Amino acid sequence: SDPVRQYLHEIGQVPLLTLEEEVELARKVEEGMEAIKKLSEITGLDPDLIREVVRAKILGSARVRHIPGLKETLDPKTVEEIDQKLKSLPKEHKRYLHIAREGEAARQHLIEANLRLVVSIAKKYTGRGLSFLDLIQEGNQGLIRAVEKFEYKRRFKFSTYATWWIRQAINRAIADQARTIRIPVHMVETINKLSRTARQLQQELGREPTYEEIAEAMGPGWDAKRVEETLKIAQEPVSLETPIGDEKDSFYGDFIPDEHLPSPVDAATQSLLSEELEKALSKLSEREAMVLKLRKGLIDGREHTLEEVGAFFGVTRERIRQIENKALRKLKYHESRTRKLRDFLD
């Protein structure tokens, strides 16, 4: 019922590796990687396509799916075709097919063996934005990189090299998802550095630091203004459903207006403006009203150049500019008289 207890059980199924069993699975993995390289040398097919085919038949038909790097869609038809053209090899070549299969199975068994290291490492990363189980699955991506990159020949135990890629993976996830508004990795590291700096400064000052103390202890290039802006960028969003009162009647969204959709006052004012603009445009002849309705864009939404208004009216650009002048002047006179439009200038 409790997902992490269930997953701790599934993990305690696979027993841990003896130094021999670990070195053996490691070695088989390295040699199967080698064998896929050799099988590409032999067949001239793409090493990644080769790897995905060997992997397909290892895991089973339960899982075959299109791979993004692969230039070909990986369905049972084409994996049967390529598995057949692989089985059509000489003994000393088809031997590399058997090698790759064994290497894939060693890979799965070594991963599933070291699945508990991931848990023991991610338990120290909770309360940092991400769920325990989210943290374990990122540690599992770390375990996968580490299996595919491990060199038994260096004589090091597996745990030592895996722990690096596991820590790497968990930290990249924490820095990549824990924020609703996502902030690049380098910037998150800068923010955290600034955190720890201010904490040192306060733990020695007996009080919080100002922007200036932090801009000093942070180093050159950093002025108080920059500390300020970096903080303003780090400011996480807050929930609309965060309550204000003991009762559930009170949310925080219930106080935020909507400044996008216009108010009925606003819309009505635009309507009265449109109508009064029409009323004062009609005192112009339809040519000068039309020249202005084009040169500003109250019709069709866009304003025209003088060449367009003159090639529409069949008149020179000086003449259409001139009847625009006189249209504007007659509108200014009508406005000095009736004063019907002043109230809309705000």
Binding site: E10, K87, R95, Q137, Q177, G253
Partner: protein
Amino acid sequence: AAIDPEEEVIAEAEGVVHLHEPASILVVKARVYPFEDDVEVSTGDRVAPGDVLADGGKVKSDVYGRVEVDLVRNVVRVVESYDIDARMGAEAIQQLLKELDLEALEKELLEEMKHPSRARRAKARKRLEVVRAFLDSGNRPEWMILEAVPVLPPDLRPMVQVDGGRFATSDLNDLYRRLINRNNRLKKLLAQGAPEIIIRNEKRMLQEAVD
């Protein structure tokens, strides 16, 4: 063989080899089949009795199982195992929902409705209510399993800058984000061919995110 050549073991003269004091011993319910010529199945292939293992057709399969081509010992090992299709989760259940022929269940349960015991009548009526709801409706039972989870339009779950410049947001945003992260991580653990246990855990966690 060994890490560095100067520790390898080479045979100085002709002799047979004997292996004493092994680290541990592994009993496997399997079937052995030696070979001398070219072998025609690789490790990972599943084979039923009557299948061609090695040497052009001479040595063949006795038992139901899965192929382990031991090259050191020059023998094909077939480990007793069926090709059983047993699944987990909503992909399985969506299958079973697709495979439900409704009218045949309507018939089964109408027959059931004649039963003397009041209990079987009650349960077959209850079930028939669902079957006939889906029938009269036009609704495919598998629709109760989501493949494409829809996204509510942004304005009804907003990211709004309040007066102070700070941001308010809705909880549906953090829920959807959880969903996209677990879905993307799943797609990437699939492409990279991750083990079973891990894909199971990602699948479960993804269910709970949709929940």
